Amino acid sequence: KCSLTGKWTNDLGSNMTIGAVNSRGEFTGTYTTAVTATSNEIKESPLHGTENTINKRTQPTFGFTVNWKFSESTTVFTGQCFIDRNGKEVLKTMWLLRSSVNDIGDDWKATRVGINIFTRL
Amino acid sequence: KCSLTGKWTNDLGSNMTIGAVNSRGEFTGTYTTAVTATSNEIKESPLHGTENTINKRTQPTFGFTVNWKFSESTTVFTGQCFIDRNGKEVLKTMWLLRSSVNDIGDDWKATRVGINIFTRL
Amino acid sequence: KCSLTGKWTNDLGSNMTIGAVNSRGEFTGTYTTAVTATSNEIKESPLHGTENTINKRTQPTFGFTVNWKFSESTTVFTGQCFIDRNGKEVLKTMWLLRSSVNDIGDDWKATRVGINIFTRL
Amino acid sequence: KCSLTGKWTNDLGSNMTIGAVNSRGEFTGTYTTAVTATSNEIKESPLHGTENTINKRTQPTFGFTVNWKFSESTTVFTGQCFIDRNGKEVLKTMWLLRSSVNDIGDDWKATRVGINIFTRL
Ligand SMILES: O=C(O)CCC[C@@H]1SC[C@@H]2NC(=O)N[C@@H]21
Ligand SMILES: O=C(O)CCC[C@@H]1SC[C@@H]2NC(=O)N[C@@H]21
Ligand SMILES: O=C(O)CCC[C@@H]1SC[C@@H]2NC(=O)N[C@@H]21
Ligand SMILES: O=C(O)CCC[C@@H]1SC[C@@H]2NC(=O)N[C@@H]21
Ligand SMILES: *[C@H]1O[C@H](CO)[C@@H](O)[C@H](O)[C@H]1NC(C)=O
Ligand SMILES: *[C@H]1O[C@H](CO)[C@@H](O)[C@H](O)[C@H]1NC(C)=O
Ligand SMILES: *[C@H]1O[C@H](CO)[C@@H](O)[C@H](O)[C@H]1NC(C)=O
Numbered sequence: 001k002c003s004l005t006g007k008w009t010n011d012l013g014s015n016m017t018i019g020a021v022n023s024r025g026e027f028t029g030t031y032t033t034a035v036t037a038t039s040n041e042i043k044e045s046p047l048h049g050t051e052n053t054i055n056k057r058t059q060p061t062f063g064f065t066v067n068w069k070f071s072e073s074t075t076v077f078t079g080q081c082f083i084d085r086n087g088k089e090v091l092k093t094m095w096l097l098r099s100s101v102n103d104i105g106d107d108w109k110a111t112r113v114g115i116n117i118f119t120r121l
Numbered sequence: 122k123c124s125l126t127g128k129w130t131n132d133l134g135s136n137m138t139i140g141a142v143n144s145r146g147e148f149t150g151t152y153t154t155a156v157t158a159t160s161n162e163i164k165e166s167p168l169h170g171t172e173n174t175i176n177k178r179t180q181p182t183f184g185f186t187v188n189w190k191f192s193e194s195t196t197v198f199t200g201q202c203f204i205d206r207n208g209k210e211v212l213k214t215m216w217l218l219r220s221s222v223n224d225i226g227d228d229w230k231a232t233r234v235g236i237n238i239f240t241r242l
Numbered sequence: 243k244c245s246l247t248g249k250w251t252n253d254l255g256s257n258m259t260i261g262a263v264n265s266r267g268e269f270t271g272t273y274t275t276a277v278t279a280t281s282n283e284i285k286e287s288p289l290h291g292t293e294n295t296i297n298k299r300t301q302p303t304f305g306f307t308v309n310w311k312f313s314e315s316t317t318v319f320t321g322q323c324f325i326d327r328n329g330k331e332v333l334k335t336m337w338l339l340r341s342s343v344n345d346i347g348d349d350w351k352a353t354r355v356g357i358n359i360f361t362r363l
Numbered sequence: 364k365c366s367l368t369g370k371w372t373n374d375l376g377s378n379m380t381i382g383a384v385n386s387r388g389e390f391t392g393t394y395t396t397a398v399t400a401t402s403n404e405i406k407e408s409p410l411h412g413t414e415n416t417i418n419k420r421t422q423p424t425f426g427f428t429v430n431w432k433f434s435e436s437t438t439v440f441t442g443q444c445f446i447d448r449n450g451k452e453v454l455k456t457m458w459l460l461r462s463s464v465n466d467i468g469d470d471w472k473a474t475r476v477g478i479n480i481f482t483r484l
């Protein structure tokens with residue numbers, strides 16, 4: 001089984017902690033990004049997500065939202081908890097980083113996309 | 122002021138209902154999708170999200186995860202709550218739909234991307 | 243049949259002209275974007291693409307790259323030429339807008355994603 | 364100076380060969396994918412792309428379309444040609460894989476997204 005609970009680090013150097021996931025698949029955690037598109041000072045930020053519980057998969061898909069405390073942005077991450085061929089856990093994820101724009105006319109350029117790989121820290 | 126609480130419908134015909142947003146920006150609700158890439162019976166699914174509260178914007182940025190109850194998939198949405206040029210509230214969103222694959226070698230094809238525009242019901 | 247050749251306009255107000263596609267599916271054209279993420283003056287830019295020729299589909303998928311003349315960026319567009327229910331042509335597309343960064347350490351934030359719908363002008 | 368011309372291989376094991384880049388930034392080549400989402404026999408496929416020449420950057424931005432010969436799909440890649448911290452050329456790319464659907468009502472699920480890192484062969 002691949003469990004979300006624990007401390008993780010990613011390819012960019014960001015760390016994240018996820019507490020226990022309840023019977024409904026929900027969990028909370030904290031995210032310390034190593035990088036920012038802003039020129040602001042980085043602060044630890046909370047995250048809230050859900051792990052898919054159908055078929056009690058041992059490598060479930062999951063999703064979570066990071067509510068940034070140092071900018072007006074929001075990032076969502078989705079991926080799957082895989083059991084590496086080495087028996088070690090790896091989170092393969094893709095994310096959408098949403099910036100806030102002041103006019104709906106600028107909405108077309110407000111969304112960045114990318115990946116991140118997490119391993120137990 | 123653009124608010125997330127309420128009932129919404131999108132360009133594909135899906136409906137979403139979001140409850141009250143608490144002091145830390147949390148919210149939950151339900152999503153009834155009108156379409157599916159599966160060959161399964163669609164079922165109302167729960168969602169948990171967060172909206173950014175930095176600078177208490179009137180057109181907040183937000184994100185939420187939909188935990189599908191009829192499949193092993195997970196979807197994440199992110200976007201902004203705008204007051205459109207015509208005066209109506211509109212949610213401009215982008216999403217990542219993650220399918221579950223069985224081997225970490227099939228991860229590359231597990232993620233679909235799209236958009237949805239939600240309007241008040 | 244849905245043909246790529248012609249003059250098109252999109253939901254953002256951008257216009258594009260595509261010449262004739264040869265026996266290999268290749269075509270060239272020009273793109274006049276109505277919007278820019280830069281603060282630069284917009285110039286008409288050339289595009290080069292290819293339409294998929296397998297099974298001689300009447301609604302083929304296609305792809306094209308826009309080589310911007312007023313910035314160091316590149317945008318790729320992919321989609322499908324659909325025959326609307328009204329018998330009119332519509333191009334449903336998704337794009338990736340790539341900005342150039344100076345260090346590979348900033349690569350994670352260099353890519354935006356979005357959609358555009360085109361109709362004959 | 365990062366150059367596109369040559370032979371490359373990526374993180375999934377696919378190989379690509381790009382020919383000479385002309386004065387207007389055009390180039391063509393061939394792509395042999397190592398994986399497929401189809402259940403078909405993979406076949407070498409042609410590609411046509413463009414690299415941005417504005418300010419004659421040494422780490423250019425670029426895009427290309429792969430016209431798959433064994434399916435009705437089309438893929439577009441975009442990214443930047445970097446000289447990595449260790450001194451090696453590396454292509455950081457993101458892609459959109461467009462499948463063909465039969466009704467414009469199924470357009471929402473036709474696009475997959477991912478990344479690929481190419482390195483010199
Ligand atoms: O840019 C900011 O300021 C905050 C967003 C940080 C972004 S979210 C996707 C990417 N992954 C990560 O670990 N850090 C960056
Ligand atoms: O395909 C499935 O089965 C479940 C996913 C439904 C997807 S999420 C993105 C898209 N938007 C929507 O309102 N419905 C579809
Ligand atoms: O930002 C710039 O300067 C040039 C890119 C323009 C972008 S590409 C995707 C989007 N569609 C469009 O018609 N215009 C914008
Ligand atoms: O799936 C198919 O059949 C053809 C698409 C191949 C895809 S394009 C993105 C991914 N990268 C790659 O090198 N091969 C796969
Ligand atoms: C977290 O990861 C390790 C854990 O100690 C640490 O060395 C590093 O400085 C931290 N990175 C961030 C972005 O906090
Ligand atoms: C949801 O929106 C309204 C509910 O009042 C209804 O007319 C419509 O059929 C519903 N659509 C779905 C997919 O449930
Ligand atoms: C192109 O579209 C129409 C065609 O005449 C025109 O009114 C409009 O000004 C043009 N838009 C751009 C961005 O060139």
Ligand SMILES: *[C@H]1O[C@H](CO)[C@@H](O)[C@H](O)[C@H]1NC(C)=O
Nearest residue numbers: 372376377378395396397484
């Ligand atoms: C391509 O890369 C090298 C060619 O020298 C070869 O070893 C490898 O097997 C090839 N891979 C594919 C998918 O063609």
